[PDB]
Structure formats: structure tokens, C-alpha cells
Amino acid sequence: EQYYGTGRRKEAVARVFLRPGNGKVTVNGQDFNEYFQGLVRAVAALEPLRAVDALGRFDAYITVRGGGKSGQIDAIKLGIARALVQYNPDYRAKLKPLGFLTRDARVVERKKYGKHKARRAPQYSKR
Amino acid sequence: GKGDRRTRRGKIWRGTYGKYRPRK
Amino acid sequence: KIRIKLRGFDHKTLDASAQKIVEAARRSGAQVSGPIPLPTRVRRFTVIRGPFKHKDSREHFELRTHNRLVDIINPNRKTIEQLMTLDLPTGVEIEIKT
Amino acid sequence: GNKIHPIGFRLGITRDWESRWYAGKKQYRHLLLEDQRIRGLLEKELYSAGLARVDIERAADNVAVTVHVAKPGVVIGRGGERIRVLREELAKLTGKNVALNVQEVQNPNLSAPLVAQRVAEQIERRFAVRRAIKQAVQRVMESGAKGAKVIVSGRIGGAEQARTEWAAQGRVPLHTLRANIDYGFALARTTYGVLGVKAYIFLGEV
Amino acid sequence: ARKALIEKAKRTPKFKVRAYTRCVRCGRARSVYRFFGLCRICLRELAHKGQLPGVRKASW
Amino acid sequence: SLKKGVFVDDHLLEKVLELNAKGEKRLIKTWSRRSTIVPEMVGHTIAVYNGKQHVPVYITENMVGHKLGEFAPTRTYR
RNA sequence: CAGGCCUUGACAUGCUAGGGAACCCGGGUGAAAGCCUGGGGUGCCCCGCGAGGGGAGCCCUAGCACAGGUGCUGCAUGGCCGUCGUCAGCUCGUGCCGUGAGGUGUUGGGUUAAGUCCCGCAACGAGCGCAACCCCCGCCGUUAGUUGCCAGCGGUUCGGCCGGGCACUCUAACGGGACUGCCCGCGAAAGCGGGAGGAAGGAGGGGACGACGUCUGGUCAGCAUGGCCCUUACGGCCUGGGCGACACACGUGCUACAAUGCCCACUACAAAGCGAUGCCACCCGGCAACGGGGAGCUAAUCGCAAAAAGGUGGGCCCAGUUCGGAUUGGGGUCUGCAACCCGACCCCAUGAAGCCGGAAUCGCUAGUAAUCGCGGAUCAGCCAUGCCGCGGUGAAUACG
Ligand SMILES: [Mg+2]
Ligand SMILES: [Mg+2]
Ligand SMILES: [Mg+2]
Ligand SMILES: [Mg+2]
Ligand SMILES: [Mg+2]
Ligand SMILES: [Mg+2]
Ligand SMILES: [Mg+2]
Ligand SMILES: [Mg+2]
Ligand SMILES: [Mg+2]
Ligand SMILES: [Mg+2]
Ligand SMILES: [Mg+2]
Ligand SMILES: [Mg+2]
Ligand SMILES: [Mg+2]
Ligand SMILES: [Mg+2]
Ligand SMILES: [Mg+2]
Ligand SMILES: [Mg+2]
Ligand SMILES: [Mg+2]
Ligand SMILES: [Mg+2]
Ligand SMILES: [Mg+2]
Ligand SMILES: [Mg+2]
Ligand SMILES: [Mg+2]
Ligand SMILES: [Mg+2]
Ligand SMILES: [Mg+2]
Ligand SMILES: [Mg+2]
Ligand SMILES: [Mg+2]
Ligand SMILES: [Mg+2]
Ligand SMILES: [Mg+2]
Ligand SMILES: [Mg+2]
Ligand SMILES: [Mg+2]
Ligand SMILES: [Mg+2]
Ligand SMILES: [Mg+2]
Ligand SMILES: [Mg+2]
Ligand SMILES: [Mg+2]
Ligand SMILES: [Mg+2]
Ligand SMILES: [Mg+2]
Ligand SMILES: [Mg+2]
Ligand SMILES: [Zn+2]
């Protein structure tokens, strides 16, 4: 019945659900290709299914919260993987080989005092 | 630009609200 | 029905003092909702180390205000004796409602 | 000039707040001022006892006021007629029902805040400073310990040229947290200026 | 003139406008806090001793 | 900018109104460079203070919604 | 700074003296400060019918002793901060060499971010530093569930709203994990390069942490403090001015010179904080700033609130323009006794220099730079484009 994976990527938590059937995709109450209209990176989150090859099979029901639309697309791209990895003891041959598993620890770092932007150091006179 | 009061941006940058950026 | 708050500072104590109010709240009758740790409000403030002019290398501190909630389902005259008279907060603070 | 304060540093772990209680934004600046003027008075009329700390706790109207000392002989009084007058004082300003616990010092030669005062005294008393240190240090090892470091500021000996007196023995991992090092500082008001004393008592490891 | 001030500050009879702050410990008018009641100088000082409840060398 | 009041200090009108009595002389000093000019107060040259002395400034309708301060120069070398 | 005033003083301590003594309400003159003045009469200790008389605090006058000074000295000082630099260093005890200053240790061989480790050696050990002990983001897990969800069946006025549920998410408290223990390659070792499993390797990536000493560094104006200097003023109050001056030069900044753009309507995705005469929903008034009403909140359970860039479609058409908003005129609003000097917003009208900047010169190695919006402190208000934080989008390049 339900197939879930914890979608999380840079202050973005996505809830992935996979129901066999058509292929319809939903997020926080909207059609995938509608909630992400404009973002040419949208069709990237579904890329995991496109290599398992098994797209026309899971009516995925997601709900991502927190972060940025793109960040969300990342959280999702991990859920769609973490979710279906569960219901396929053999589908491990992709989440490890085709690097689809990493929280991307890559995240914004604290702004140190005396550095306009956590690193960009102020100007300089000397004279 | 962020410097024109009579503009959405300008008003925003200034942190204010008004005829060019009302409260809904 | 009766609600109880738990602020304070050292989450090392507050945790215990709260936890106590359950192992002792069950013995007094009605069941209770396990010590629920709600979010922490924080007080951060920066200061310029030097007492003069050195806007850099300054130094800021924190003041973690831990909060903690727990609640009894049914108000037994039993529990009352305990809670009301078992006032044992070293540096804790508790508010009660309904 | 750098080096952090081994207290505020250790603060989190090892050493706990010398004043521990709680209060909201409404009133906190008050229970601090209070907690302050309290210690303010205690450090005064009680020095002759050499107190090396003043914990303080609360809840509501109640106050710990716990005073650690090395020479209680003057804390309580003759049979008990000193402390009696102190509770009065603490109350004479504290519109609260402040209590007043007290303890002793299993060894003053392991109480930095004292080693300092002891030294701070000697200088103020024209003693020879090098010795007063080379000596005050040993006195801390002789009485069982693992770390002792004393430091005196400039003006040693009325020298128009302010120097600095160093002196320590054993180990003192000022950067190491599992240190439990007692840090103490004392003044000195010599007619020819002012002195400062640092006391480092590295005690139990881990 | 920093003595007469601390007192002058305490008094308040005139227009609430002029009612201004000032460090509790040291007679300092600049960089005070609506909390602590201390000045940056003072605060950090007490802070290091521990006489400032729940206050801890921040870390994140 | 005052749209309900006129913040024009009282020891002025007070001394201006009593002077309004049949209208006599005029020499009148003050430190209210902070108050406003009142209509009909023309002919009443009011020396205003600036921190140094009192500028013997005449006053006429041309100038009204102004402050006696605008009329007093605070700094030197204008 | 100018002007008008006050002296044991705006504040500490102690003592002497007849009066009155706690306290509360005014008035006159004045710019205020200040000076001058007019009104009820008191629980206390106690002889005492009572009147009244003695009198302990506190207060008012007088006088005495003293206060006070951001006045000088940071080369008289404490404290604390800045710098070489988190750089790999600096030293000590004993032995030994040397007339001695001083060596040796700590020179040499390999390695490392490292005085990191190893092996050598008249050295044998040690201390302060390095590292580690500490917190955070990370993987997973247990306890706890008024954040959360058709997640499962559910009733539902069609919003997690109600019943109800800890599975998610989350909040916050305690744990496992990673130790060169595996395999191959080189070696005397330490240990280097390669590879798998793993969320993560060989310190995993950021914080906190900054040795002996150096700059006669900084600060007597935060504070402390020795010496010096002032006392009807080098002290104190007050109203007004000033620190906001402007022919000029520099530092750091912000907005720009535009179509990878600007404008306008609509529609989304944050994090982190904050709130009692405080943040304001929601109404009505106004083009608006804002103003009359008024719900909720002791605040994971109401508000600040809208994220912006983005996405949609609509308008400009390469023009100093619908680029850019300086300047100034007119009309207003809010805090405050008070916006002339000198506040911040608003609206109309003005639309300045600027079409990418000489010689020079700065920052940054990845969630960084660049770019967009947000919170907070201080604080009535604010000159904040500053600072300290948060998150969104998200690169180029590193032969050497
Ligand atoms: Mg960013
Ligand atoms: Mg600089
Ligand atoms: Mg424009
Ligand atoms: Mg002398
Ligand atoms: Mg003066
Ligand atoms: Mg003010
Ligand atoms: Mg006096
Ligand atoms: Mg100094
Ligand atoms: Mg000098
Ligand atoms: Mg030797
Ligand atoms: Mg010899
Ligand atoms: Mg030697
Ligand atoms: Mg070493
Ligand atoms: Mg080998
Ligand atoms: Mg680390
Ligand atoms: Mg110098
Ligand atoms: Mg001073
Ligand atoms: Mg003035
Ligand atoms: Mg001014
Ligand atoms: Mg200035
Ligand atoms: Mg100006
Ligand atoms: Mg929305
Ligand atoms: Mg924030
Ligand atoms: Mg929050
Ligand atoms: Mg309406
Ligand atoms: Mg109102
Ligand atoms: Mg209202
Ligand atoms: Mg303008
Ligand atoms: Mg350019
Ligand atoms: Mg060029
Ligand atoms: Mg050149
Ligand atoms: Mg770099
Ligand atoms: Mg801001
Ligand atoms: Mg403000
Ligand atoms: Mg301005
Ligand atoms: Mg600034
Ligand atoms: Zn202070």
C-alpha cells in the first residue's frame, strides 16, 4: 500500500509516498508540474524512477515543507529514492552506485563577526 | 531601483509600505 | 485537565524535577501525558571583548531558557496533596492551569 | 593580551554558576542587582574570614546565600552572635526571607581565591614578592595538588618600571576542560600604586 | 562629571523623554541593555565569573 | 509638524497678549527659537537667542508659520 | 560654548546646636534653574486627669570634618582588548662539554597541519603550547507526545475544522557510530598512496579554544588605581547653541549607469528571532503615512507577517529613456513638553551627476563568491545604507 521515504535536503523536509498505478505526482496539495511551474529543474526530482525504468507505476503522493522550491526538489529527489529503496531489497543497485544518497551536507554556514558574509571580508585601506 | 520611493522595490528596500506597496 | 509549565535554565535539573511529577502523578491516580519537551527560547547577545575599540574578535553569549510541559488527565484529590505540597524546585519555576 | 577566563570558560561544565536560580524578563535585572548587592556586602564585612565563594539560590522570596569559608571562627561568632546580626543585614535591604547556609574549606591551600588574597596581603605588607610567590606556590603543592600557578602584575617593589612576576609548578592544562582548576584574583593597594594577583590551582583531572 | 550624573539619571521628575538608561554597576550611559542592566564591559565581566544566571559562553 | 496644536510656548503670547493691550512699545527678548510666529505679532521685534546673544529681529506677516529659530543663525560664516 | 543661578553642595560618613522636626496641597518672579512666600499638624518613648515637659529615628537651618572633578599622567599602574598567529614555537630539573657568555636536550634520518609520531644521539625526563577532553550540522536508534498527517477506517458546516491517532514531520533528552580493527602496495618503525563497505574515514566539515614573550601597542573617558592639580570653582543646576559647521582630501559604504532590464496585476518555497499600557488580526476613515474602534496573546497553540529574488501575462523598445533617483517647491502624518537649526515616513510636482570609471587597488577556493529577502540589539522617535545573526538561488578557477 503505502511506500514512504524521508525527504530532507538543506532545510527542506519532503514526505514521499508511493502508490502503484498511474503516475500522477502530488506535493503539498498540487499537481507536481504545477507547483513547480517554471523551474526547469522540476523534472529532475523524478529522475530516480527513470532508472529503476519504473515511472508508469507509482502514483506518488508527496508533501515537502520548509526551504526553497528547488531545495524542495532536492528533498523530493531523495524521498522518491529512500521511499522506493525500501520496497525493493535489490534496488540498492542505484542509490549507492548512481549517487542518489546523501542528505548533500552542503548548507549555509554561520556568518562570522567581521565578515560581511560569513567569509567576504570587508574592504581594505592600509594607507 | 531600490532607491525610488514611488516604486514597489524602493518602498520595500526602505522597509516601508504605501500607495505603491499597500498592506493588501 | 490541569496544565503545568516548567521553565528554568539547566535542563539537567528541570528534566528531573519534571520527570518526578509523573512517577508520582501516576501513583496518585489518573494517567498522565509523558514529560513533553517543547521548543527552547534563546537569548543571544554579542559584546565587543575589548573595553574600548576593537569591533572585531568580539564575543557573544547565550541564555537557554528551557521549557517543558506535562499534564494530568483527571484531577484527583489524591494528586493534589502531592503536587501542591511537593514544592521542590531548586532553580525551577512552574505555572499551572486548566 | 588574551587568554580566556578559566571560569567563564569551564562555566558550562565542571564549574557551575556561582549564582543559580531563575527569573523572567519582567524581573531579572532586579534579582541580579540584588544577588549583587548581597555579595557586595558579604565581600566587605566578612573578609576577615576569607570567603572563597558565595553561591546563591532562589525560587520565590527565598534566598540561599550560601557562604563557603576557610575560617568560620568569625562567621558564626562567639557562641553564635555574629551571623545572627548578618541575617539582619541581608534582610535590612532584602525585603525577602533570606536564609544563610555556611560551610568550611577543607584546606585554604587549595582555594585559589584565598591563595590570591593570602599573597595579595603579603605584598601589601611590604614582604619580598619573589619569595611570597615561590613560597605561596609550594604551600599549594605541599597541601596536595597537581597544579599551582601564581602571577603578580607590575610595580613590584615600588619599581617605577612595572614588571611582572611569574611562578608555577606541576601541570596546568588551561586549555584542557577535564581540569577542574580554581582560578583566583586579588588586588593590592600599596601607597606606590596597585598590584594584581592571579591564582591557578589545577586540582583533580577528568 | 560622572558622579552627579548617575544620581541625576536616577531622579526623574522632568519629562519622561529625558528618562534615560545607564549601567547599574558602572556609571556608563552607552551600550546598556534592557535586560541585564549591565554595560558590555560589566556584563562580559560578571558573565565570566558566573554571577549571571543561565548565561553561558555561547556556542553554535 | 503639529496639525492639532501649535507648540508655541506660552511665556510668549502671555507677554505678547498683555502687550496687545492697546499695543505699546515692543523690545522683547526670549529663548524660544523653538516656538512659532503668531499672526498679528508683526511690529513686535523679538530679539532671539542663538547661544551667543539675542538677535534683534523684527517680525512681519511675510514670516509667520515659521519659528523664531529659523530667523536666528546658530553658526557663523553663512 | 554663551548666558542665568547654587554652595557641605546633585551623592557617602560622623559630630555639635535653640527651633521645627515624618508628610501632603499651593502661590509669586523667571527662559528654566534659582531665589521669596502663604496653608492642615503628626502614630512614637514617657512622668502625666490635663495642659505640657524630656525624647530615639527622619527632616529643615547653622557651623565643623568633608564630598565632588570625563582635570593631567596608559612611559607610574591593575584589569581587559588588539598584533606577530593557531603560526610551532618557548622553557625547565639533573648530568655532561666550555675560562666563560653558552651549548647539549630541542643538531641528524623519515613523516605530519604540528616540538605529530618514529628511529637515531651525552643525554635522561618534564612543563607551558599541538592534539585530545566540549558544543553544532551530519547516519540510525529509545523515551516523550495539543507541531504534525485520508498517514489508516472515520463523521466534517468542505480549513487537521471535530472526533481521534504517534506512523510521519518536528520539538528535546539520553545513546550506538569510526577504532587504520579489513585487503593490496612501500618500510626498521612511525607511516604514505590506492581500494571496498559506509551517512561519514584516516583530525569528517564548522564553532569555543589563541604558549614565553613582542610592539615603553590601546585605554586614567567604562571601572579600579599611585602621584599631580581645582575648591563660592578645573565642583553642581538650568534654558539656548554645539558635537550635524564646509573652498576642500581621503576611508568604508549604499543606489545606479539599464533589456540576463525596469514597471504593473496575480500566484508561491524559508530560517531565525521578537513581543504587556507590547507586537496587532479583523473592521470602518484616508490615494497613502496613518487614525478612530476592537478579537486573540502570560505566547511550538494569537500577532510582528509580507519573504524577495523566483512563476504567469501584461506594458515599455535602446532613447539619458517608463534607465537613474540626487535636488528642490507644495501638501501631510506619527513619537515627543519640543522636530529653526537638526528626526523619520507619505503624497503631488520637480527629474541632478551618471551610457561602467586614470594611476592604482580589494574580497573570495563551494554552499564559498555573487545575488535576494528576513530577524534582533540599542531604542519614544531615528538620520541603520552600520553591526550581529538567518535563510532563499547558486557559479568560475586552481598548470604551477
Ligand atoms: Mg546566503
Ligand atoms: Mg581596519
Ligand atoms: Mg525608476
Ligand atoms: Mg606620599
Ligand atoms: Mg560641567
Ligand atoms: Mg532618549
Ligand atoms: Mg551636607
Ligand atoms: Mg595598563
Ligand atoms: Mg609619560
Ligand atoms: Mg642543563
Ligand atoms: Mg663547568
Ligand atoms: Mg643550559
Ligand atoms: Mg611536545
Ligand atoms: Mg617493511
Ligand atoms: Mg570537529
Ligand atoms: Mg605609548
Ligand atoms: Mg579614571
Ligand atoms: Mg542646552
Ligand atoms: Mg543640539
Ligand atoms: Mg559625530
Ligand atoms: Mg548639519
Ligand atoms: Mg503563500
Ligand atoms: Mg532571525
Ligand atoms: Mg520562531
Ligand atoms: Mg472589510
Ligand atoms: Mg487606539
Ligand atoms: Mg487600534
Ligand atoms: Mg525627494
Ligand atoms: Mg564595472
Ligand atoms: Mg577601463
Ligand atoms: Mg601598473
Ligand atoms: Mg580558500
Ligand atoms: Mg536588517
Ligand atoms: Mg528602533
Ligand atoms: Mg539623515
Ligand atoms: Mg553604520
Ligand atoms: Zn558597566
UniProtKB/Swiss-Prot annotation, chain A:
UniProtKB keywords: Ribonucleoprotein, Ribosomal protein, RNA-binding, rRNA-binding, tRNA-binding
Protein name: Small ribosomal subunit protein uS9
GO molecular function, one term: rRNA binding
NCBIfam families: PRK00132.1
SUPFAM superfamilies given in the database record: Ribosomal protein S5 domain 2-like
GO cellular component, one term: cytosolic small ribosomal subunit
Function summary: Part of the top of the head of the 30S subunit. The C-terminal region penetrates the head emerging in the P-site where it contacts tRNA.
Oligomeric and partner information: Part of the 30S ribosomal subunit. Contacts proteins S7 and S10.
Pfam families (alphabetical): Ribosomal_S9 (PF00380)
Protein's GO biological process: translation
Family: Belongs to the universal ribosomal protein uS9 family.
The organism's place on the tree of life at top rank: Bacteria
Swiss-Prot record, chain D:
CDD domains registered for this protein in UniProt: KH-II_30S_S3
Pfam families linked to this entry: KH_2 (PF07650), Ribosomal_S3_C (PF00189)
Cellular compartments per GO CC: cytosolic small ribosomal subunit
Family matches, as SUPFAM superfamilies: Prokaryotic type KH domain (KH-domain type II), Ribosomal protein S3 C-terminal domain
UniProt keyword Repressor present: no
Gene3D superfamilies reported in the protein's UniProt record: 3.30.300.20, Ribosomal protein S3, C-terminal domain (3.30.1140.32)
Keywords: Ribonucleoprotein, Ribosomal protein, RNA-binding, rRNA-binding
Domain KH type-2: start-end pairs: 38-106
GO terms, biological process: translation
Molecular function terms, GO-annotated: mRNA binding; rRNA binding; structural constituent of ribosome
InterPro entries: KH_dom (IPR004087), KH_dom-like_a/b (IPR015946), KH_dom_type_2 (IPR004044), KH_sf_prok-type (IPR009019), Ribosomal_S3_C_sf (IPR036419), Ribosomal_uS3_bac-typ (IPR005704), Ribosomal_uS3_C (IPR001351), Ribosomal_uS3_CS (IPR018280)
rRNA processing listed as a keyword: no
Family under the similarity heading: Belongs to the universal ribosomal protein uS3 family.
Quaternary assembly: Part of the 30S ribosomal subunit. Forms a tight complex with proteins S10 and S14.
Function: Binds the lower part of the 30S subunit head. Binds mRNA in the 70S ribosome, positioning it for translation.
UniProt protein name: Small ribosomal subunit protein uS3
UniProtKB/Swiss-Prot annotation, chain E:
GO cellular component: cytoplasm; small ribosomal subunit
Residue numbers binding Zn(2+): C23, C26, C39, C42
Claim: RNA-binding is one of the keywords in the record: yes
Reported cofactor(s): Zn(2+)
InterPro entries assigned: Ribosomal_uS14, Ribosomal_uS14_bact, Ribosomal_uS14_CS, Ribosomal_uS14_sf
Alphabetized Pfam families for the sequence: Ribosomal_S14
Cofactor binding note of this UniProt entry: Binds 1 zinc ion per subunit.
Keywords: Metal-binding, Ribonucleoprotein, Ribosomal protein, RNA-binding, rRNA-binding, Zinc
GO biological process: translation
GO molecular function: rRNA binding; structural constituent of ribosome; zinc ion binding
SUPFAM superfamilies: Glucocorticoid receptor-like (DNA-binding domain) (SSF57716)
Protein family per UniProt: Belongs to the universal ribosomal protein uS14 family. Zinc-binding uS14 subfamily.
Role played: Required for the assembly of 30S particles and may also be responsible for determining the conformation of the 16S rRNA at the A site. Binds 16S rRNA in center of the 30S subunit head.
Record's subunit section: Part of the 30S ribosomal subunit. Forms a tight complex with proteins S3 and S10, which cover it.
Name listed for the protein in its UniProt record: Small ribosomal subunit protein uS14
Curated annotation (Swiss-Prot), chain F:
Gene: rpsS
Name the record gives this protein: Small ribosomal subunit protein uS19
Gene Ontology MF terms: rRNA binding; structural constituent of ribosome
UniProt entry keywords in alphabetical sequence: Ribonucleoprotein, Ribosomal protein, RNA-binding, rRNA-binding
Function: Located at the top of the head of the 30S subunit, extending towards the 50S subunit, which it may contact in the 70S complex. Contacts several RNA helices of the 16S rRNA.
Subunit and interaction comment: Part of the 30S ribosomal subunit. Forms a loose dimer with protein S13.
GO terms of biological process kind: ribosomal small subunit assembly; translation
GO CC entries: cytoplasm; small ribosomal subunit
Naturally occurring in which organism (per UniProt): Thermus thermophilus (strain ATCC 27634 / DSM 579 / HB8)
Entire-sequence positions represented here: 4 to 81 of 93
UniProt similarity note: Belongs to the universal ribosomal protein uS19 family.
